[PDB]
């Protein structure tokens, strides 16, 4: 931790616009805290609408110059690979910064950095692999081709839970395709995003190709979603902000890519491996204290093992070790902010008022070393049902609900009874049964006998209200491409429809 | 005669909506009179549906989707059903084309071309249906299997324009059915005739109840239900930019995917080394086919300065000779515009143009000619002495009007052509194919024609850069609008992580 | 027979015309059910085959079919599909007459054939090549896919029209010209499909049918310099010979040869399902199937139970005329084929295997005059034996036991072949593990036999070269051209001035 | 430019292995036979390597099979396989200088040609490393209810790989990179006369680290080990680049065990120059097409077709430039053309001069070994232009593979196409004209795997390379190149299996 804090004395405090590190246009700043102790650890520029506008216009200018958009795909790939190698070179420092900024355990952060390296490498290898299609034209004496071009100028807005990971999923395909980008990380977690911009600057990109805005989404976010020069807005975050962004993007018919949260089901059958299912229900529920887009917040367990399951899960929940993400014995860190802890605490009261049981946790911990930090106990809510707000709404904290089901049909019905559709799991040693269930769940990713894995080779995103579009995989790249049909008529003749 | 044969078809055509396997009236029994724009006579009366009718249709589409009868059908069989629709179109080609000319006013030859195109669209998607169900991924995690499955998106609402009703319907219906979606379509309230007919033909083919639904009515009544209902998974709209933006904002309320095609300010770029009489011929065709009521109409001519005066005088001469008339008369070259309201809008743009300093070189008003006095006619029009700052140059007029701007260099043509909010389609005319190819690369247009104007086809994707839309129709990209990806990851050797204390 | 054939052509089809053999030779075709002559056809010469190849080349270069739009080619292929369905009943009867198989098998073939033509009809216009993002500044790179040109196509006697459709449909969809030669023994449905294609209408020389003995015309069809791809389905020995002769003009080959196809039955299989599917794997078309499940591998813990159950069912199989609805298994195809099956029984006994049931021609009076052979089960076998390793291609299965999953895999993969096979187990995880380790082009889990146009089919190892069906099937009939345009050409000036 | 890039004997060979590499060990020939390697610039013996036996090749093949079946490479994740292939690409670049020098020493080509080769080689490995994890197969929408249908793409298995002497390490890379990326085991044999960079790249791969038996290097003559490599029952694919006669022999031998073949066999590549070409450019590129690597290039522009209108001007401009070509040591910066590869090969080229004369063609310039004192001991042959020839002639039809072009005239576009296509081959060719529409019409009608419009020579990993007609079977490079090293498996699962009950019970 003192090592990580020492990293801060060389980190930039500034935005990066059109090839220069710059202050906010009004010289405003923001203090960044460590959620473990709520101490101010760092102070950064708080940019303005003018800054956001200047960045978007620089991005457009750079795009039209062609220095990046007309660079060869192979060479773009090499540069993206150079970024991947910087991440690896600096993986420990980056992991330390992430833990400092977001509070999650160092082991969780190291896992993030390994994924981030793999995301940049994947897209580096994909950059030069498909430029479009030749079409067999149905018109004689014509040639028809579809060319994929970069979409242009893309704005990118990321959340506070996995700052550098979510940044990588957007930056990698944007660069690989030849777009120019303007990125804004969550105002409360800018550290690793600043650091990655320093690393990309070292790699070397044309002026204007990459830009970093720092500030509140309520001030600069509308410029980012609403500017006429933007061709795509890509946002990861909560549903209410997502809808707001999409409505503003309509003003200029701007394409949107959204990844919102979910209400992710963890479906546990009679015939599951019991010990495995307990282990994975904990992991699904409490990794990063539940602040995960794909958190397994909604446990559905078959009625014949429900009491035995509840008893085992609760007994394990009482043993979960809370503490500083820098300490090796810590299993769960704090939540992100005062505001967010408050939202979680309020949900406990909502749960009780609508008739649910707080079987364990549901409060801040007492222990003396946890008192300064933004800790909330791991929580299990029982005696609930699908009509309840605690079941339906994304709490995004260290909280799971437990509902029973009788049949495979009932499990599918309950799991699909939410507005969301991001991810979920099915546990059963009957693989045929698990596959039947997976093919009826309206979810972007279904894990059979696992919980959590995503990776660059496979697209990630929502059905229903969990988003629009996909990140990662070949579909992820295509978000950053636009198709052009060029049709050449090799024997052009007058039509002579209109009288001479 | 052909006109009276078309009118006879209406004695046996449905007057109702089609909801959940039944032809039904509007819930409040209101009706709407349909007009022939050639003589402005009322030719048919149809139900005017309610917002609750739209709601019922979407709910029926949801229940049909969840039942799985169409969505779990084999892709190969879904293919065969889509082909059967294609064969109905060709079977009824003459009747459908006549109905289209009766409803939209366009020439019979134009409507025949549409029917050939519609048959090929359905046939393309029928052949595509069973060709790609997803991918197998080499997982980076040992002892896992990773597959991506492509599923139907679900319930789709589909809203189409008055200019090419059945063509635009085909571009939406065909991929929706091929992929296993359930759909709710609403044609333009003004032009329901061929869409009602194609619903009759699809009903004959045979689909599970609720898989297809037809709503009739004015967007202001039912439109917000079609874009805004929670149970829609995708809304697909072709029409104007202001309605498209409205639809997108309303779809956001339930994070509903959108597919938009919104028209354009499509450039037609003529170099001084173009085949001159080809370029004159294609400028006419670009500007005045369907009286300029075309998403891709070449309304903005860009012509190299060295031939600009010759081009203008040649174009003006030919425009004066364009034959306006009844679309059923084989001598007619240009029909009427679609409605009173649209003709007024075009007239109001002549006033704007004149007040901002442009010249109306020829045309620019409704014809006085006695033979055209009862129809919704507007003269083919050429506007000169204009520039890119002008409303008449920037804005989509969607009538039989072209503007002509000069350019000196290749570079200047490109900057003028990209200097609009739009990005649908355009053309470059030049014998120098290398030069045309350089220009095509730098135009921000979904489709660029080299030495042609107008062609689209089912094999290639169609749609906009910039404000001309979101997404693509036709081609494999068209099909993909109607599909959603699911990653199914199976851990074949699951082990406890043991992160949390026991 | 006479009634079925009175209107069928008896000639070859070369360059738009039905023609006799150049030397006027003919061949008598036999019904294997009664060994009676049922039809007489032209027996063409090597000069006829040369003339067809040269017409195919002339047609291809003229461009009438090869430069037709892919969408229109797909419409013509769709028209062939619809003719097949229109004539389903007669085609199926013709196939049963010629090959001996049950009429219900022949209907199933016709339905598959319709689907094969309709799949390739729909694929015809879907993929014309790629645009490439060039690593060289100021260049454009594109890959155009073109028809390969002239293709010669040789089909076997077991599924004449099905195998013909697998080759014809992608050839025509892509724009190739073709010359096809059915097995000399079984020309009837192939002659018929040429009459149907002629009705559909194709430019002269685009399609050609040669009729004759491979011994005479076969080297021309594999060896002629103007052939761009040779496609052959048949036995391994002819396939190697074809490949060697194709080498003379560096001619691409596609080969589908036999298999020694394993049917793996674990002790947690659905038992009666496994018994049913072992029967079907072994004895459909009298075992004369490239993917016949001739090699049963059954877990030792249930081996004796399985053998008793299978043998008991084998004794009930109904042999007979393919036109009689009670018939379950038809005759084998020819005297020489039945003789080879018979020779394998002698081989089996001499190397120490047991003929547990069957193993002989039946002597019952209504089978006496036809080319019947009893369904046969051979036990007390092992992997060292000829009867286990070699493709007998008759109504013959062997049974070997295995102890464990790893032994099942090692036995199943211990042949020269790699066509197809099956795994039966209620543990789907185990079945998937085994599937991934089997070196087979198609692996069925809890099934036996299904193939379809949507999915590629073909061998690992000595079962073939290339794939038929699916997108990979189409790609055999296409060649890639990279066209690279330098849009700012400048002198290199490597060499002094 | 395409084949010449800038920097940005005892010495360089002192640390190089002299042995074969089989099943994880550097090993002598089983009979201790050796072979002297020469520098074609001076005909000096520069190195001595093991000359393997038929039994060495069989042992390598059995090792590769054993490694394949163990699954240590074939079941590694595609992403990890991609990382290893990139580590190879990185070692090429790290050692680019030494590798380029070694390639010039062994093949005689100029150092700037060798630098271009090393840059291409790096890019080949990098391309395939990036492709490794990008397509594992397909999900199929099954036409049978209650079934799941998937196609998986697996490594082919054991591959044997035989490479020619003209671009030894470049050709090795085209084969090694997709084999390793897909998870195959391989056994590679370079040309017996040019082993040096291939030995070096095996040393480098060994440092990267691959399971034992995954990679194997056999050294020796085709006459000795070649039939094992084409003919062994455990081989799943044989990949060969070289001449048509050896390729046909290989294909015939591969047939014995129904082994897939991938062949690239050279060509008779046309260089078509219209009278509206940029003249100066067409002259420059006729020289480049003709005389890079002394014409020892699969895609060499040996057959010039020039439009009659400009034919005389063209011939005199070309001849004047050919007289100025600077022959010499590939290590000297001013050398423009090196020697040819071998005594045997130079003899083949010289013989073709007597074929040309005896059939009535004119040797307009060149046609002999040079006399000049510093060229006398090396395997030099003068750049040669042959005129007054036609398509009936052996000199026009046959691949000479030396610094020799022929010039034919044509009147029309149709005639140029006729002539360009009137050979047994179909590898590559060019069209020069300022009329791009016309170049495009010609390109469409040429039966060639690669057509360049106003350029000559470029190939790259992103696009497939290979022949129509007798220039080969299959493609190397691009996604098609990967697919030679993959085999498809359809796995069909019946999820609700029912008895068929065809056979009575
Ligand atoms: N594609 C090309 O770039 C290329 C390269 C080299 C040569 N060629 C052509 O080949 C002609 C003759 O060339 P060459 O004789 O120097 O080389 P070649 O065609 O024999 O290629 C050499 C390779 O073949 C091997 N070989 C010999 N017998 C074999 C066998 N039975 N099985 C397997 N491999 C065997 C040799 O050991 C060597 O590795 C030349 O005139 C030239 O036209 C083309």
Numbering used by the authors:
A (entry chain B): -3 to 496
B (entry chain D): -5 to 496
C (entry chain C): 0 to 496
D (entry chain A): -23 to -16, 0 to 496
Sentences from the paper on this structure:
We studied a putative BADH from an early MRSA COL isolate, denoted SaBADH, and showed that it is a functional NAD+-dependent BADH that utilizes BA as the primary substrate. BADHs are a group of enzymes from the aldehyde dehydrogenase (ALDH) superfamily that primarily catalyze the oxidation of betaine aldehyde (BA) to betaine; some BADHs also utilize other substrates. BADHs resemble ALDH in structure and are composed of a Rossmann-fold NAD(P)-binding domain, a catalytic (substrate-binding) domain and an oligomerization (bridging) domain. The solution data are supported by the structural analysis and emphasize the importance of the NAD+-driven structural rearrangements at the cofactor-binding and substrate-binding sites for enzymatic activity.
To maximize the structural resemblance of SaBADH to its native apo and holo states, we determined structures of the enzyme in the absence of BME. SaBADHBME(+/−) binds NAD+ in an orientation similar to the ‘hydrolysis’ conformation of the cofactor. The lack of a serine residue at position 234, which stabilizes the ‘hydride-transfer’ position of NAD+ in NAD–G234S-SaBADHBME(−), may also account for the observed flexibility of NAD+ in NAD–SaBADHBME(−). When the NAD–G234S-SaBADHBME(−) and NAD–SaBADHBME(−) structures were superimposed, the NAD+ ‘hydride-transfer’ conformer of the former structure fitted the aforementioned uncertain electron density of the latter structure. Furthermore, the conformations of Cys289 and Glu255 of NAD–SaBADHBME(−) would not allow dinucleotide–Cys adduct formation. As suggested by our previously published mutagenesis and shown by the crystallo­graphic data presented here, initial NAD+ binding causes structural changes within the substrate-binding pocket that facilitate BA binding.
